Design a protein around this nucleic acid. Structure first.
Ligand SMILES: [Cl-]
Ligand SMILES: [Cl-]
Ligand SMILES: [Cl-]
Ligand SMILES: [Mg+2]
Ligand SMILES: [Mg+2]
Ligand SMILES: [Rb+]
Ligand SMILES: [Rb+]
Ligand SMILES: [Rb+]
Ligand SMILES: [Rb+]
Length: 136
RNA sequence: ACAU
DNA sequence: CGATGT
């Protein structure tokens, strides 16, 4: 219904899908960029959306912050809930890095706890999430 | 269909 | 127009 402004918003950006993937997290209220991942040569939109949420969880936990996380990705929210990124991307030498990071993010989820609400950013009502890359 |  | 996902 209403935006929870006291929150962290995350999003993927890419060049191609599959293609070069990056992600970032921003303060929903101010747009301040709080973290940005260096581009990964090949990944998918959904893998990057998943990594962005898990990075947000780790970022907030390290800082003892109870803020929720907004994501625009129905898929990645479910993958985090399930602790399992069900990507179709081939696992090969070219995709090794993204898959390593996804595997490590799942491993983190399986070894840590959090109460962080992971909320759907309602793009249809609120416009683009504040972490968006402005590329579409 | 919906979400990217 | 193409792609990734539930
Ligand atoms: Cl990562
Ligand atoms: Cl909340
Ligand atoms: Cl959702
Ligand atoms: Mg997104
Ligand atoms: Mg975006
Ligand atoms: Rb902590
Ligand atoms: Rb964009
Ligand atoms: Rb979107
Ligand atoms: Rb589709």
């Amino acid at each position: 219904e209403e935006i929870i402004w006291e929150s962290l918003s995350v999003d993927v950006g890419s060049q191609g899908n599959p293609g070069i993937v990056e992600y970032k997290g921003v303060d929903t209220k101010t747009g301040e960029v709080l973290f940005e991942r260096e581009p990964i040569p090949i990944g998918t939109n959904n893998m990057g959306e998943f990594l962005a949420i898990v990075h947000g969880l780790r970022y907030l936990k390290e800082r003892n912050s109870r803020k929720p996380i907004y994501s625009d990705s129905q898929t990645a929210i479910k993958w985090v809930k399930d602790k399992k990124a069900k990507s179709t991307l081939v696992r090969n030498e070219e995709t090794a890095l993204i898959w390593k990071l996804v595997d490590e993010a799942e491993e983190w989820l399986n070894t840590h706890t959090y109460e962080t609400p992971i909320l759907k950013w309602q793009t249809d009502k609120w416009g683009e999430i504040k972490a968006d890359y402005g590329r579409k």
